[model samples]
Target chain A: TGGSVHSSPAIGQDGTIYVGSNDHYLYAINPNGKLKWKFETGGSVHSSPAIGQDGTIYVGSNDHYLYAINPNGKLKWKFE
Target chain B: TGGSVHSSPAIGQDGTIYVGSNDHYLYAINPNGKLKWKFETGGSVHSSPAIGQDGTIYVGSNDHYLYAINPNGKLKWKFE
Candidate 1:
């Protein structure tokens, strides 16, 4: 289970759910509410995520970084 | 005048700008940056607004209510 998610969830066209939590992680959950994967960050995440046209998930963290994660729950890049 | 704005602005097709502020108001600004109108709420406004296809505005208020405002700045309905 993930920690408290202050960030709003963004649903992808393929049904993957992406959201950020105060637990310092961005989680990708299945449509069934099961965890698909999670990416750790250096600080609590409160910024809501946005999904791009090409399916890149973008979100900001209190850690002073903006992350771009791929549809497969892998990191594409991050801006510090 | 509006207070600090935390909610994201939503742009309508006609270039009308909609945004919320801690001043407990949802503001409609013209593209020229002049105030078109504002809708008052009971509490600080933080929730981002959503624009419907028919130009109705849907936004949530910290006052524990969701408001539906018509394009003419009239209250269509509200859900508490």
Candidate 2:
């Protein structure tokens, strides 16, 4: 609680954690302080993020496009 | 005439103006008093909208996603 979190938040139905950052990556962490995944992005992302019902994540970047990523840390698709 | 306007506006190729109002919709009025189109979003749309090179439009909402619509008032895609 001593720093900044520019990433918008997402929560699972049971409350898992997901967020993206200007630090140039997306982060997934469990409730127990465990790192799940960190996906690299093309550039800094500042948009508010969203999570699809099927576990897909969507977020936009300053690189001028939106990115879609799967639950397993794979790139699904990107809209430019 | 004492209401508020909350939607970010877009300008046409010829500098015509378009803006969305919190009065529950998007408004498209001409340089004069003529009207063009007024599309509606699910909730108050406070975010800015983008106009493509081909004149396509894109925007997001607090309803949790972004939408792509054509200049002719057709829905192309809505990411949720």
Candidate 3:
């Protein structure tokens, strides 16, 4: 929560919000604006997330990798 | 048209797409995917733009300046 939020937020179909943080995490917020979960990245998550048709989230990081996160807020895959 | 698109596209309410390019320009595209206008900057426009309530588009350039562009695809002001 200390890192600047340069990256924008991507809202899920269910009204959940997903956004990256310079603190090396992707935070998920419920529709009620409460913390749902956070996924850690190797470095600052500078890229905003793009959700797929199936609800998979994709984003990039300063660590020079792209990650696809599951809707449950867990890592699905990452490519460097 | 040659620079890579690391910056994400921001859509206006009217379906206009705004995005920065490493080619030192901010592109404005219409909903039909046609070029609307392009604003030139001093350096690569790596930062994604944020729109204000007044329709001002704010973006950062690697030239170390922040620019406020009008919704009409014209520069309003810039600060370093």
Candidate 4:
């Protein structure tokens, strides 16, 4: 149920969908539109995430930082 | 030790100053105001350089690829 979409949505290998909002959070939803998890960062997350082979998510924040998060909803690190 | 810059500049292990300009060239300048070398690429290099532990510089370009360059101004690799 994609609605009002702007940024390209991400669908995981296990049916997990990822999307970011202008509100500064990247949301991971199920195929049924149920929220699975979310990661909040400073400023708008205009940079779409790149899911690595290890299921690591790399994204950039307009707040002048890059964040790398693992599959378990934990931050690996943030680079400024 | 002062200049008008938007992107953050990079300093090498041996004190080489690396900076990018709106002119789309990554310029390697010595401690003095003389240029040592430069690399040209498409699009503005607004992305700042991230020096790795191995003296490698990684950067992204709006031209749609991530580039890795060695400290000696050589193209190491490109990731699309």
Using lDDT as the measure, which candidate wins? 3
Q: Report the C-alpha lDDT of model 2 over B1-80, residue by residue, as the tens digit.
A: 01133333455554333444444355544433245666677765556566789877777766676877777667778899
User: On residues B19-60, what C-alpha lDDT tens digit does candidate 1 reach at each position?
Assistant: 888898889999999999999977776567766656777665
Model 2 CA RMSD to the hidden true structure, in angstroms: 13.8
Pick out the ten consecutive residues of candidate 3 chain B with the lowest summed lDDT. B1-10
For each candidate in the order shown, give its overall lDDT on alpha carbons.
Answer: 0.75, 0.59, 0.77, 0.62
Per-residue lDDT over B1-80 for candidate 4, one digit per residue giving the tens place of the 0 to 100 score: 13234445788787778766556666777888788788775655555655555666655444543456777788876543
For all the predictions, what are the DockQ values? 0.05, 0.05, 0.06, 0.02
lDDT of 3 at B13: 65
Candidate 4, residue A64: lDDT? 94
- Highest TM-score: which candidate? 3
iRMSD value for model 1? 9.1
Misplaced by over 4 Å in model 2 are A1-4, B1-80
- Candidate 4 achieves a global lDDT of 0.62
Listed per model, the TM-scores of chain A against the true chain A are 0.92, 0.84, 0.95, 0.84
Q: How close to the true structure is residue A65 of candidate 2, measured as C-alpha lDDT?
A: 41
**Model 2: chain B TM-score relative to the native chain B:** 0.77
Where is model 4 chain B poorest over a 10-residue stretch in terms of lDDT?
B1-10
Write the residue-wise lDDT of candidate 4 on A1-80 in tens digits: 11111223444666454555456776665544356777888876667676788878788877899988877677899999
- Displacement of residue A74 (Cα, Å) in model 3 is 26
True contacts kept of 3: 0.02
Cα TM-score per model: 0.53, 0.50, 0.55, 0.52
